[PDB]
Design a protein around this ligand. Structure first.
Ligand SMILES: *P(=O)(=O)O/[C]=C(\C(=O)[O-])C1=[C][C]=[C][C]=[C]1
Length: 345
């Protein structure tokens, strides 16, 4: 690979701040050589600087953790990707033909319940932040709506799919998702900054605060740090750090978290758009220089995350801006992948 471009990374973070992120940061693990940059503040009221060691909410990067657990269950003979979800969770879904593989790849047609939660960003946050939902509650909310496409027929990202994932994990193992994450992923990889504390609202240790951008242009930011994340759970509630997400995605792509057969299933790409694919709880992004990278994004309130690795896991990148609902920031932070993998132009 090209050398990572730290000048480029610096410019990306500075641009993100100019667009409304209180803080922005990035760490690159380049085959044993670290790159680390940060600009701005973890806490905009106190002025505490953000750093690459600050913990944060990784949001929908959680889907990759959920997928790893399910694929290990496939390896162990406990789960068949091509069986009906309703084979394992009887009467759960409106269509018995929706399969596990389809849920994990966002091809199920299940309506995304978050549609009905966060259309108004800040009011929706205030509605959910202190609620505790069961998995079934979230499924019921989705099923107030019809499916949006036939089983397997179309890609349509939906949190409902990874609510189903968590129910499958807990059903088939008899354990909580926290226990499964801890025993299958956090402990083996020594992810000392990584937690699943739902429904606790505290982020353990030193962390970036999250700032939700209101829907109204120019509106004051809302501190969204402390919430249950119960609306997401196995779709979005993991806490981590840049070092730990780098370790996780490197381990995944280098073959350490499941059999080769199941990693191949995880990397069967469903088209998202002309430069992106979705596997099983895994994203592919195709970068401008002809490099593809693999990982996931997160957008949980107040935190935009990119965590991606090269195909062999030898270079990994995690970037965080501590705002959300700000597409200028979101698009700018994607440029960290360009600078880190494509290097200087
Ligand atoms: P999650 O709720 O943190 O993130 C949501 C994402 C994502 O994975 O980046 C998303 C993706 C596509 C469409 C809607 C939401």
């Amino acid at each position: 690979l090209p050398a990572p471009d730290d000048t480029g990374l610096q410019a990306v973070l500075h641009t993100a701040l100019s667009q409304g992120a209180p803080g922005a940061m990035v760490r690159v693990d380049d085959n044993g050589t670290i790159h680390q940059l940060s600009e701005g503040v973890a806490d905009r009221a106190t002025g505490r600087a953000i750093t690459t060691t600050d913990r944060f909410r990784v949001g929908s990067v959680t889907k990759s953790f959920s997928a790893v657990v399910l694929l290990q269950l496939v390896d162990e003979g406990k789960l068949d990707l091509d069986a009906s979800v309703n084979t394992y969770l009887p009467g759960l879904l409106p269509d018995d033909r929706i399969t596990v593989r389809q849920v994990m790849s966002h091809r199920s047609g299940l309506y995304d319940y978050t549609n009905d939660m966060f259309a108004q960003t800040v009011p929706g946050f205030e509605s959910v932040r202190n609620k505790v939902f069961s998995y079934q509650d979230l499924i019921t909310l989705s099923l107030k709506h019809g499916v949006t496409n036939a089983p397997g027929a179309a890609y349509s990202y939906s949190n409902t799919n990874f609510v189903v994932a968590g129910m499958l994990i807990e059903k088939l193992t008899g354990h909580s998702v926290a226990t499964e994450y801890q025993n299958r992923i956090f402990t083996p990889l020594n992810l000392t900054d990584t937690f699943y504390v739902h429904p606790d609202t505290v982020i353990p240790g030193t962390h970036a605060n999250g700032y939700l951008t209101p829907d109204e242009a120019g509106g004051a930011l809302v501190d969204s740090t402390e919430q249950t994340v119960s609306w997401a759970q196995s779709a979005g509630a993991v806490i981590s750090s840049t070092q730990d997400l780098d370790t996780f995605f490197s381990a995944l792509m280098s073959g350490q978290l499941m059999s080769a057969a199941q990693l191949a299933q995880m990397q069967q790409w469903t088209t998202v758009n002309s430069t992106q694919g979705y596997g099983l709880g895994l994203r592919r992004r195709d970068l401008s220089c002809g490099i593809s990278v693999y990982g996931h994004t997160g957008t949980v309130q107040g935190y935009y995350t990119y965590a991606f690795a090269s195909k062999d896991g030898k270079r990994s990148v995690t970037a965080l801006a501590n705002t959300s609902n700000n597409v200028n920031v979101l698009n700018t932070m994607a440029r960290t992948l360009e600078s880190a993998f494509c290097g200087k132009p």
